[PDB]
């Protein structure tokens, strides 16, 4: 992705969703939407932000049904017009899988949900994350999200899932974790508030991009 | 509810999910709405379904964020005007309290999902459905999920959470769950394809509350 940096679009009013973007679509070509702003906005909203910034859209929707569902809600997301999107591992091996198929199907790309970055994850993520790891690697799930803020945790997955697997990681910036640190381990960094709640988010952007070319 | 049954709408069209609600509306005054339907005909369907059934509304968000995002989520359904939403227990306590407090501002309700019904949910859900549930417990947490298609793991989380907690349970019927059988444990049983794949959708449902009447 370009520079490293996916932004996390989760203002929930369109005009504002649209200003930042359009602010910082120069440093970023691939945008994470998520159910704050579908849920506020429609899910029309992808093919538009897809039509007229020309950015990935990964649909961040945190799958985490029965198969069935699962099959469902990937089917409407990929009509929708999104290149990929993001499944919880926590729900077991049919559940990830309902969603490889309609991937498949479609021409798409699913990436799987490791261990979360805020204080909660240590409750019950934490310690079945690395079995969810290898459970992904074991059905060919080659895109895996894992926490800027446990660096020793996304070296952990990088291990299980090797180099050849793509890694996203969230929770840089206003949830603590560090551009640099994240990128040794990490293909790309997903942030959000701390470029959407910043006075200027394209220098809140360029500033993320120097942080990290060096 | 009425009849202790609870309609699972995920049919992903609006005319053929108006149709069949309509038909069984004289049998269940609580419709569960999820993604299926909120991702092709966008969240007014909510509201829709309010004023033209006069019924409660759950929505089956099986919300899985972190907790600020959780905090939007909720915030955009009870907005959208849905009474109850279901949360995902599995990221851990502050992801649930912040479902909470968005319940408490507004006036509504969380259901805290235990253990799943698919086949999936014995690799991870299940080891941690206990003491899941016992975090509901101790969080103030009074609506549960709980498995059909396991009535002994319905039955110890009944023991968890206590009588006067309320317990709905999904995976009756296209599953494989007894709607008697888990009305042993549950308070209200909810059923989807049963129903609304139903040659006679108000036959289906009328069959099963005649089969629990008993
Ligand atoms: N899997 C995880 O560890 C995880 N942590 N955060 C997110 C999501 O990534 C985004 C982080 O946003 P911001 O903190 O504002 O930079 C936001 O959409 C949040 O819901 C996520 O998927
Ligand atoms: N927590 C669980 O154990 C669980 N099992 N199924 C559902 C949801 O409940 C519904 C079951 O539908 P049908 O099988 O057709 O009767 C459907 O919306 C499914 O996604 C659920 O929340």
Same mark, same amino acid.
Do not use: W
């Given at each position: 992705?370009?520079?490293?940096?996916?932004?996390?679009?989760?203002?929930?009013?369109?005009?504002? @969703?649209?200003?930042?973007?359009?602010?910082?679509?120069?440093?970023?070509?691939? +945008?994470?939407?998520?159910?704050?702003?579908?849920?506020?906005?429609?899910?029309?909203?992808?093919?538009?932000?897809?039509?007229?910034?020309?950015?990935?859209?990964?649909?961040?929707?945190?799958?985490?049904?029965?198969?069935?569902?699962?099959?469902?809600?990937?089917?409407?997301?990929?009509?929708?017009?999104? $290149?990929?999107?993001?499944?919880?591992?926590?729900?077991?091996?049919?559940? +990830?899988? @309902?969603?490889?198929?309609?991937?498949?199907?479609?021409?798409?790309?699913?990436?799987?949900?490791?261990?979360?970055?805020?204080?909660?994850?240590?409750?019950?993520?934490?310690?079945?994350? $690395?079995?969810? @790891?290898?459970?992904?690697?074991?059905?060919? +799930?080659?895109?895996?999200?894992?926490?800027?803020?446990?660096?020793?945790?996304?070296?952990?997955?990088?291990?299980?899932?090797?180099?050849?697997?793509?890694?996203?990681?969230?929770?840089?910036?206003?949830?603590?974790?560090?551009?640099?640190?994240?990128?040794?381990?990490?293909?790309?960094?997903?942030?959000?508030?701390?470029?959407?709640? @910043?006075?200027?988010?394209?220098?809140?952007?360029?500033?993320?991009?120097?942080?990290?070319?060096?």
């Amino acid at each position: 992705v370009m520079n490293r940096l996916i932004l996390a679009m989760d203002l929930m009013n369109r005009d504002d @969703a649209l200003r930042v973007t359009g602010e910082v679509r120069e440093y970023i070509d691939t +945008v994470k939407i998520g159910y704050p702003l579908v849920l506020s906005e429609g899910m029309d909203i992808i093919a538009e932000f897809r039509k007229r910034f020309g950015c990935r859209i990964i649909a961040d929707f945190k799958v985490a049904d029965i198969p069935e569902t699962n099959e469902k809600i990937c089917r409407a997301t990929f009509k929708a017009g999104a $290149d990929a999107i993001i499944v919880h591992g926590f729900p077991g091996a049919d559940s +990830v899988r @309902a969603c490889l198929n309609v991937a498949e199907e479609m021409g798409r790309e699913v990436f799987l949900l490791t261990e979360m970055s805020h204080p909660g994850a240590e409750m019950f993520i934490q310690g079945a994350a $690395d079995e969810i @790891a290898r459970m992904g690697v074991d059905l060919g +799930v080659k895109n895996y999200v894992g926490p800027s803020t446990r660096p020793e945790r996304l070296s952990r997955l990088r291990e299980i899932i090797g180099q050849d697997s793509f890694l996203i990681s969230p929770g840089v910036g206003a949830q603590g974790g560090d551009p640099g640190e994240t990128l040794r381990f990490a293909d790309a960094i997903i942030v959000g508030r701390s470029i959407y709640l @910043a006075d200027n988010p394209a220098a809140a952007a360029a500033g993320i991009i120097e942080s990290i070319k060096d």
